[PDB]
Structure formats: C-alpha cells, structure tokens
Design a protein around this ligand. Structure first.
Ligand SMILES: CNc1nc2sc3c(N4CCN([C@@H]5O[C@H](C(=O)O)[C@@H](O)[C@H](O)[C@H]5O)CC4)nnnc3c2c2c1CCCC2
Ligand SMILES: CNc1nc2sc3c(N4CCN([C@@H]5O[C@H](C(=O)O)[C@@H](O)[C@H](O)[C@H]5O)CC4)nnnc3c2c2c1CCCC2
Ligand SMILES: CNc1nc2sc3c(N4CCNCC4)nnnc3c2c2c1CCCC2
Ligand SMILES: CNc1nc2sc3c(N4CCNCC4)nnnc3c2c2c1CCCC2
Lengths: 580, 580
C-alpha cells in the first residue's frame, strides 16, 4: 500500500530533488565501497530525471550497468519524535539505497513507488545517502530485455533510466494512516441519482473519524469507523471532461490524511463500455512519459501542456502506454476529467519476432512472479482514481501462443480480485492475433487491438489495407464484446509534404487515419479510437527508426502535425456519450 | 552509330519538344487504332519529361503499361530534297513510333538514342505522329523488374517513364556522314608532349576532307581520307578540372559535321589509375538523372547547377549511376573537365535479395542478349568523350554466384573490343562479395565497391563498422589492382540535428564519412572516393524509404546538407593527381 505523500497537519514533506552527485559504475564500484565514502571525481546530475540524455557522447547515453547517485541528508533532531520515511516514487529498473554506508532498501521495477523507514539508521549530523541504479533488462525484467555488452529492448522505446521520479522524505505519527480505500454504489434510478460510499481505513503502530467535504471545502457528513460507510444524495458524479471531486479527511490517532475522490460507475454491457450507465466512446491516444532532455523523467509542465492539448483537440482518454505513469499525472486526470487506461510494465512478453517459444519454462520468459507483484503494487496505488476505468495487464504479449492462456489467467484473476471496484481487465493485442487465436477473447472484458493496416500491413496500398481491416474487425465482432483500437498510426516526419502522398508525409498520415476511421465507423461494437502516438518519442536506433518513433500526432516538443488538426475536427463532432 | 544531332551548314535541326497530346492506355488502346486517329479526351503533357509526377493522384504515378504521346508534324516540301530523320534520344522502356497510322520504328531500352527515316512515309500537309511508351519491367528488361498488376523494381530508384529525352527532326544530304571516330597517341617523353590523332570517317548513300581547329576556331591542320591521320605538336591535353577541347570539321560530299575532342591518355598501372600518365584520385559521387517534377526527364539548367556545385565542392568525377545520362550532360563534362564513369542500364541483375538463382537459364534473368546491344549502343555513342575514363558493365549484379563469370565475360570482352580507346572496364560490387568470391577480381581493371559499413553493416556502431571495413578493404588489396569506392553513405533527413548523433541526423551522416574516409586513407591502392548520393532522389515506397532515398549530400533541390560542407573542406585539401 502506498499513499501519495502530501502536506497534512499530521505529516511533513521535504523534497530531495536537485543536483546530486553522480558517477557511472566502472565495474569496480561495489568492490570498493563507493556507497560508503563520498563519490570522488563525481559528476552533477539533476534528480528527478532520466540521466541518459543529460550528458554528451554515447558513454552516458548507452551505459550498460550501474550508476551511483549520492546526496547528503540531515533532519532536525526535533523530528525523531515522529516516524521518518524515504519514498522513492520510481528508480528505473533496480534500486539499492545505502545510508551512512549500510543497505537500507532494495527494489525491482522501474515505474512504481517504494519506501523505507529511517528512524533507526538516521544518524545525527550529515548522512551520506546513496542510490545505486541498474539499467540491465532481460527475460526476468518487465519490460523485457531481449538478446538482440549492451541492453537490447524487446520493446519500441528507449531504455531511459536513473531516478525517474522524485525522492522525498515525509513523516508520520507512530500509529498512522497507511491505506484508505473507498468505493461507491450509485442508484441512477432516482431522477436525482445519489450514492453511498464505503470507507475502509487502515492504521499501523485508538480512535479514527472520517470527514467528507465537497469541491469548495464545505463539510457535508461525518462518521467513525476504520471500516464504516457514508451517504450522499444529489451526488455530483465525476464525468469524462466534467470532473467533480469530493474530498475526504481521515483523522485517526493524531494523524490525518486527505484524499480526493470522484463518484462514477464503470460497467461493460454487451458491446457497450458504460461510464455512469452511459455508452462511452474512447477518443484519444497512447502516450509515453517522453520529453527532452528529461528522458522518461517526470515533467509537471508538459503534463499540463499535454492535457491542455487534449482538451483543445477534443479527446477524452489516454493509455499509460507500456508502464504506469507518475502519481501526479494520475491525480491530474482526476482533476481534469481524463479517462485513463492504466497499464503495467509488461511489454516485451513476446519472443516471436531451435526457436524458443515465448512461454517456454526453461528458455523463455521468467516474468510471471514479478508480473504479479506489479499488478498488486499498481492496483494498490491507483485503486481510488476515478480516472482509471480499465486495467491493461500487458502490451502485445504473444497472446496466441502456447503457454499464453496459462500465463495470463492467474494475472487476470489476481487483477479482478484486487480491484475494490471490480473494473474491466484487458490486454492489448499485437498484429497477427484473431478472435479465435487470442487468449484475450476469453480473459478480457474489452478487446483492445493494435492494428497497422496502412503501414506495416499493406502500406502504401490503402485500398488493400482497408479490405484487410474490414475483414479482421468484422470477425472480432462475433465475440459480442466491446472492441477499441489502442494503437494505429503511421511514421510521419513533420515537414514532409506532398500533393500526391508518399509514406512519411504529413499527407499520407492524414489519409491513413481517414481510411481506418471510415471502417471503424461501420461497427457499432467499436467503442474507442486511440491513435499511436500522441507525440514523437525516443527509441533505440535501427534502420526503421527515423531519429526515434515518428508516429506522433505531435512532434516531441508538442507542435501539431497536420493530422492533429484532422483529429481535432473529427473528435469535435463525436460525443463522449451516445456516439452509438 | 549515333552522332549528336547539331546545326551544320549541311544539316538542319528542329526540336519537337513542347506540350503533346497524351492518353493513358486503358487496355483497349491498341485494339481500337488510337495511333491512327487523333487522341480523344486527351491530356496535356510536356515532352521531353517523365510523366509520372506531372499529374495528380496515383493513377498517373503508378500506371502499369502503355501511354500514348501524340503530336502533329509538318515539313516544308522544299526539304524532301534531303534525307529526313526522327531521332528519339530516349523513350523509357519500349517505344513504338506511328506516322499517319503506320508503325515506322520500335525500340527496347529506355536510356539510349534511336532513329528512323521519314522520307517515304512523310506525307504532305499535317502528319499524325504517335509515340506509344511502355513502362513494364521484368527479367527481360535492363533495368530488371522483380516479382516483388504493378511494376516492382529490382533496383532502388523510381520507375520514371515517358519521353525522357528530346525528340528532334534533322536532315542530311543523301550520302552523309554517319560515324566519326578519333583516337590519340601521346608521347609524354618530350618535355613539350605532342600527339597524333587517327581519323576514321564513315559515309552512306565522293570526296571527304578533315579540318582540325583549336579552342578559338583557329584552323591548324587539314587532310583527306575516310581513314586518314593528323599531327599536333605542343598539344593541349584535356585534363580533369582543366578541359581543353579541340574541334574537328569533317567536310564530305556536300555534308559537314563538327566534333569536339580532347586529347588525354587513360591507363591502369598496378594500383594506380593514370590519366595522362599521372596517378589520379577520384573525388565525387554517384548521381541520378532525378529532379522534380521532371522525373528522369532531361534538365539542362540543373545539369549546369550540378556541375557548378561540384566545382564549388572541389570534386572531379561522377558515375552515370544505373543508366547512361543524356548526350548534353556528356558533352558538358567534356567542356567542364569532369571525369565520368559511364554505366549501362544493367542494374537488378541479382535475385539473391525453391529459391531461383540469378543466372538460372530457365527461371533466372534473360538479359544477356540485350545487355550486349546496350554495351554496343553505349560505346558507339560516347566513344569520343574525353570525360569517359572507364566503363561500368553493371551495378551490383550477383557477381559471386554461379553463372556469374559466364554471364559477364562475353560482355567484358565485347566491351574491351569495341572501345577504340581500350578504356578500363569494371562492374560495381554489392555488399557481400570479397576478393576471392567476386568474378570482378579477374574481369575488371578497377575494383569498384559499394560498401555501407556504418549503415546497413554495423550502424549505429561506427567502431565495429570500422573494424569490418579495414578487414574487408585490407583483403581487397591482395589483388594488386586499383580499388575505388563507388558508393557509401547514410540516409539523412535535412534538418534533423543532434549533439550526440543518432542515425538519420546530419551529424550522424558527417561522422559516418569521417570513419570511412579515415580507413580509405590508409591504403595507397584506394584510388577513389565517390559518395552515394549526390542528391536525394525518388524511389518506390517502402518502410525503409523516408519519402525516397535520403542518402544525398544535397537535398533533391540541390541545397547542401552539413555533410556537403564536410566534403568540400576535405576535397579542397586533396589533389586530382599525386594524392599518393
Ligand atoms: C502486416 N504484417 C506486419 N505486422 C507487423 S507488427 C510490427 C511491429 N510491432 C507492432 C506493434 N508495435 C506496437 O506499435 C508501435 C509501433 O510499432 O510503432 C510501438 O511503438 C508500440 O510500442 C507497440 O505497442 C510494436 C512492434 N514492429 N515492426 N514490424 C511489424 C510488422 C510488420 C509486418 C509486415 C512486414 C513489416 C513489419
Ligand atoms: C551488412 N549487411 C547488409 N548489407 C546490405 S546491402 C543492402 C541493400 N542494397 C545495397 C546496395 N544498394 C546500392 O546502394 C544504394 C542504397 O542502398 O541506398 C542504392 O541506392 C543503389 O542504387 C544501390 O547501388 C542497393 C541495395 N539494400 N537493403 N539492405 C541492404 C543490406 C542490409 C544488410 C544488413 C541487414 C539490413 C540490410
Ligand atoms: C513483438 N512485436 C512484433 N510483432 C510483430 S508481428 C509481425 C509480422 N506479421 C504479423 C502479422 N502476421 C504476419 C506476420 N511481420 N513482421 N514483423 C512482425 C512483428 C514484429 C514485432 C517486433 C519486432 C519486429 C517485428
Ligand atoms: C540486390 N541488392 C541487395 N543486396 C543485398 S546484400 C544484403 C545483406 N547482407 C550482405 C552482406 N552479407 C550478409 C548479408 N543483408 N540484407 N540484405 C541485403 C541486400 C539487399 C539488396 C536489395 C534488396 C534488399 C536487401
């Protein structure tokens, strides 16, 4: 369980972000005890941020192995009173915290938070904090390092690493709040729908009371109970592009924490994805925590810029593509009313492109245990987010291979059981699968395709490509379930133009999406269009990557390609609800 | 034999270029007799020029089959006196001339001239000229159409077709000059070298006398003899970047034709490519008759612009890449002193990339007969060009396959025997061959490689790529022959920049050439560096082509990439002669 550190009367918060000392491991790093003494001949390195692009030459950009972040720490003795904790929101890949020279914590997983307490190794005076980060990826990591001394991603984005998100120090009373959970039942029956919310607070280390406020701070109800309930008639339902967030003050044993919460219902019904009992239609794109020169590092300004562009463009949703995003971005979609598809680090679980099969148990992937710890850690983190309407177990696994069904079912189950809101589960299907062959047809509530008819398939022949896409999508309808496209797009170099289009031209990109959009619009069970990608992003080099991935509607610096004006006009004529 | 039509006291010249009528064959074209009546519902189409890009939509750009050019013709009766001839300098692929409705000529081969006489079907009044052009390419065409209703080039440029070069009407006395030939012997021994030129005139249908002038029109010697000789002491030797052209007036039977000619010697000696008994070093690039929206159409202005840029850049040579260039460009290099490697249409003679082998005689290529007619027609056309120092039988054939040696030897032989100057012969070797495996090691006077260490091989690892290129080039030296690189380069999108380079960036392109150029400079038997390509050009669409081929040093409109300034600085510090 991981609550978002905030400033409360009961808890303090001090950011450690800034320029830290930094050294690339030379192999002999751990041998000598760098985590013991202050790094020598060190380099400077802002935190929070990916370090790959922040220096010059390939030696930083393409480093294999470990790096050492190092910074000094010092708390006021008058604080030992309360509990001292170190929250690392995300260290890409493996983290190893040393204080004063001793290991204190260790973590696997580059995109989710982890904490460690400091009360009993926090010395007096100036303490030597050391965070060593490893970037190696393999068949035991999610995301999955392939075989082709260098990391070779089995995924189409660059392997940005370092202290990707912030490192803070918060405190707490000795017995504290540790995990608040809230769910809602809404009775749309009444012409003025109302709702009953179920609280479930948890403490560790006494009386606990719950206060419920409205948008403006107006209190409206109170109760006591580490597992009580609450009633709200004439309830302001959170809605896509129309967020309403209540707030919640849990006072419990000299400790109080506040939580926003939006009241809405998610439910699949036949070929309809329903939000607050209405037939939604996804409009938006798959995104990437990718900016220059931050790498995958957190970027509050671009977060707001990205959401400003989405509203300008008349979109309503995005998918945390290939990894969970920052907590800040998740809260922002709550405030702004952005429907989010929250997705795990499970990309590259596919060895298809003697031959080893993906789910061979001696020579194939070794990810299921960690895949489970991710599903749990992620749902623990974002369970209370009204923006989250669905979960994505994995992006493009070899889901039509043998071993496939056996791999994923234990993970779907774990997901369906750990979501206090029992939200729809899916996985994003790669090109090649079909209704009959895809283990997703059974395990998933929503069929999410990534199809590229007009690019990989059939490009530059958009007629032949249309025939293919009708044929395949037609078949997908026989499952009687909601199907949305989570990726489709074409690599386009901003600036390349032509009257009779050729591939890579802004005109070819617009035509591609006209064909796909025409076919989408023929099937009432298509409940979503999400283009890949929102914006150009960095990938590993290869002959097929024109200085990265150029499938964005926008450039890496958020300037619109012609296609961005095509979608803005199309999405403006398509409602959040009732499109079918 | 084909003399360049010019204006002489004995012969007239009238260009037919302009906007002709034009219709795409619909299949039923030949059935109905379009070549008989005036085209109906016709379109407009400039000649000379490739027609693919001159209209909108894929229907022109990607047409499979025949098109019909049609224009009216009318000569003044007072001309029937003399012989009337129609010279088509180049109709891409197959040509079929109809006059008044009757076929008069037929041709195969899209890049060389062919004529037909008109005296006895040239009616009085207005005659209906019709030129039908076919664009289909196959295992019987040079260049070679692959299997992958559409043409699929087995070569990396777009299949531009139509009346690529001009169509004129010249006349002649009844007995006329038909082919002048001149060769030279130079006695560098004397401190003031002199030379003896051997004339060899030919007539068809009488006295013939030869006049010899100098640059400014000063006569200097005369003689009589359809096979006489001539003497020139203190001779002005044509030289790279220092052209001196004498002129030659052949008066013979009321017919006179003038010819420029430059005196120079070409001779290989060990690992030295010698021009006028000096160790030359090729500096330049492989080019393409490719401009917008002309297609492969002739372009006198860009010809002069291209040659202006070459002198600005301190280059000395270029290769007629994948097909003979226009006669105008050939004469221009004579005037301007550009060393040219004249090359045939023989590209795509390679099926490597049950499996058919290139030179299978039932299922592989069927090009050798035509390949021979090309070698003869080409040498007949350009034999007297001082700029031509070498012949290229084919670009990147599967020269290390079985059948290879048997295919090419008859063609090398035919070439070595038909060049009145016995000039060096070669063929350009694809990536994969080695000294031991390449039938070129024996048949060729100069080893011409196309290597891509840093792109296809090894990119983005320029270290590994350097190790490979040293290893391979080292081996090539064991043949004790001159080796030059006729292609090397990297696809670069003008405008993409970075401090730590990634592929496709102008910086990566400059680094690529620094590595290759460093290694080249280690081997005294490397006698040439020619980059691919001079300028960005159109190709068929595919995932590996960013709106065409972007390996130019210049953009398709002749603007320099950063790499163009790298070469200009490097080539300025490297002499035409004595570099080794
Ligand atoms: C019709 N038959 C084909 N089907 C396919 S599928 C495929 C392929 N994947 C697709 C799916 N993406 C997904 O989409 C995005 C993207 O690719 O840009 C990624 O950014 C994103 O992270 C990822 O989720 C990951 C990788 N990569 N390369 N080639 C192909 C290919 C090809 C063909 C025909 C031959 C040429 C290649
Ligand atoms: C090191 N191993 C490789 N070696 C090679 S070779 C090759 C290839 N040809 C080369 C040579 N060109 C010539 O050079 C120019 C160009 O290619 O741009 C053409 O314009 C020009 O007309 C033509 O003369 C014609 C085509 N095309 N595609 N891939 C390759 C490839 C590859 C690899 C490794 C795997 C990836 C692909
Ligand atoms: C794991 N992600 C991928 N998935 C796929 S699927 C497919 C394909 N198709 C699919 C449709 N059925 C016929 C064959 N052809 N080529 N490459 C691919 C392909 C690739 C990748 C990533 C590596 C590069 C190629
Ligand atoms: C006829 N022109 C070519 N020549 C070549 S050579 C080579 C290669 N290499 C060469 C070095 N030895 C190992 C294998 N790999 N992939 N493609 C190629 C390749 C291609 C083409 C044109 C079609 C596309 C690929």
């Amino acid at each position: 369980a991981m609550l978002y550190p905030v400033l409360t009367q009961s808890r303090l918060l001090s950011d450690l972000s800034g320029v830290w000392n930094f050294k690339l491991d030379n192999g002999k790093g751990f041998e000598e005890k760098w985590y013991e003494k202050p790094l020598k001949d060190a380099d400077t390195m802002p935190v929070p941020a990916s370090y790959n692009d922040l220096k010059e030459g390939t030696d930083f950009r393409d480093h294999y192995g470990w790096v050492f972040y190092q910074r000094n720490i010092s708390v006021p003795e008058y604080v030992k009173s309360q509990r001292i904790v170190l929250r690392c929101a995300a260290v890409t890949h493996y983290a190893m915290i040393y204080l004063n020279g001793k290991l204190i914590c260790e973590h696997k997983g580059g995109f989710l938070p982890f904490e460690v307490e400091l009360n009993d190794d926090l010395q007096d005076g100036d303490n030597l904090l050391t965070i060593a980060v490893n970037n190696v990826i393999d068949y035991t990591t999610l995301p999955v390092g392939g075989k082709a001394p260098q990391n070779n991603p089995n995924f189409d984005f660059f392997n940005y690493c370092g202290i990707t998100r912030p490192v803070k120090i918060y405190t707490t009373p000795e017995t504290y709040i540790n995990d608040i959970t809230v769910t809602a039942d809404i009775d749309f029956t009444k012409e003025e729908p109302s709702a009953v919310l179920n609280y479930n607070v948890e403490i560790k280390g006494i009386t606990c009371k719950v206060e419920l406020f409205d948008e403006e701070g107006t209190k409206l109800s109170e109760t006591e109970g580490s597992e009580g309930t609450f009633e709200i008639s004439n309830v302001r339902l959170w809605q896509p592009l129309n967020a309403y967030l209540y707030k919640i003050k849990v006072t419990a044993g000299q400790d109080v924490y506040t939580l926003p919460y939006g009241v809405r219902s998610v439910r699949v019904d036949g070929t309809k994805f329903l939000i607050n009992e209405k037939p939604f239609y996804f409009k938006g794109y798959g995104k990437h925590e990718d900016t220059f020169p931050n790498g995958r590092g957190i970027n509050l300004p671009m977060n707001t810029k990205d959401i400003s562009i989405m509203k300008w463009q008349h979109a309503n949703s995005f998918r945390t593509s290939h990894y969970p995003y920052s907590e800040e971005m998740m809260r922002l979609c709550d405030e702004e009313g952005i429907v989010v598809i929250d997705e795990t680090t499970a990309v590259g679980v596919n060895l298809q492109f003697e031959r080893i099969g993906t789910f061979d148990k001696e020579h194939g992937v070794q990810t299921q245990e960690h895949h489970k710890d991710v599903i749990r850690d992620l749902i623990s983190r974002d369970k209370n987010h009204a923006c989250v309407v669905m979960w994505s177990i994995a992006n493009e696994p070899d889901s039509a291979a043998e071993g496939a069904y056996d791999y994923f079912k234990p993970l779907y189950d774990l997901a369906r059981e750990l979501d206090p809101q029992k939200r729809p589960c899916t996985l994003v299907s790669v090109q090649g699968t079909t209704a009959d062959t895809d283990c997703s047809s059974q395990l998933s509530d929503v069929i999410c395709l990534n199809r590229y008819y007009g690019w990989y398939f059939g490009g530059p022949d958009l007629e032949v490509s249309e025939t293919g896409l009708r044929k395949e999508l037609s078949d997908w309808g026989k499952l009687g379930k909601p199907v949305m496209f989570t990726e489709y797009g074409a690599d386009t170099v901003s600036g390349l133009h032509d009257t009779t289009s050729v591939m890579y031209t802004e005109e070819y990109q617009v035509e591609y999406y006209e064909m796909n959009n025409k076919v989408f619009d023929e099937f009432d069970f298509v409940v979503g269009e999400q283009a890949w990608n929102f914006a150009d992003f960095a990938t590993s080099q290869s002959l097929l990557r024109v200085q990265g991935n150029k499938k964005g509607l926008f450039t890496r610096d958020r300037k619109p390609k012609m296609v961005a004006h095509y979608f803005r006009n199309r999405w403006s004529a398509i409602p959040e609800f009732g499109y079918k």
